[PDB]
Amino acid sequence: MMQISSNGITRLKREEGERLKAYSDSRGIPTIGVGHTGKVDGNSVASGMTITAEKSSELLKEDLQWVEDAISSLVRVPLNQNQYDAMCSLIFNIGKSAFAGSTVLRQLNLKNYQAAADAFLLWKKAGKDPDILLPRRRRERALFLS
Amino acid sequence: MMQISSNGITRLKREEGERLKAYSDSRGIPTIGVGHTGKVDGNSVASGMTITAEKSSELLKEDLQWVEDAISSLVRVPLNQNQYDAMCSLIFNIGKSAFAGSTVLRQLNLKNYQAAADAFLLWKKAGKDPDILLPRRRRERALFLS
Ligand SMILES: [Mg+2]
Ligand SMILES: [Sm+3]
Ligand SMILES: [Sm+3]
């Protein structure tokens, strides 16, 4: 089955931000790497923990399994790697349920790939800002179409 | 049999670089994926060939057969999966002959595992820079000791 590429990982890290020192996120959840909140080598993330970029990649691939599974489950048409990598980035952000209900998905499964790419741009709001995710969506759309 | 793990493949792809569109290496050899120069789907690698990340990983797993075979034929002591994955990365780089004559091998076969790990750091020179591979060797050593 398909898998995220090295370029896909690099681009996703850029979009998400990578933090090699543990921190408490805006909700209070200990986090490290690229959004990793689960255990790291058998222990909970905690103040003072540091990891390498390569460990951060390892953890991110573990945390992307639900994303890759969702694409495998939901998408029934061919994807090139750039399309796949872009979708990984979108889905990692908006979540599986949002993607399952999305125009991106519906258009993809009709093989309207340009329309699916354009539908990335709908996923632009966060909180009280109607367009804060639009620059990310544009970069993902560009990758999808590349 | 022991074989490279998915973690081992990810880490090796990081060290080597992945190209999903065919290119000519610095010597002029058509290459794709992670150092693949043989045919892909029955055709010679050539300008215009594209592949997926899944393909790239499956090609790499097959291209590593000489590495896996070198470990089986030369290493006389047990290896855990992290050790194995780190060895694959070193050997894929320096080649079978270099590994056969190495301090890494000698120390490994004496069951001097820490000294074997440390001896990775000897394989640091390339061209006119005496340490340019040292960061890679340190990362592989860290994987070995993990
Ligand atoms: Mg063999
Ligand atoms: Sm396959
Ligand atoms: Sm899985």
Ligand SMILES: [Sm+3]
């Ligand atoms: Sm705004």
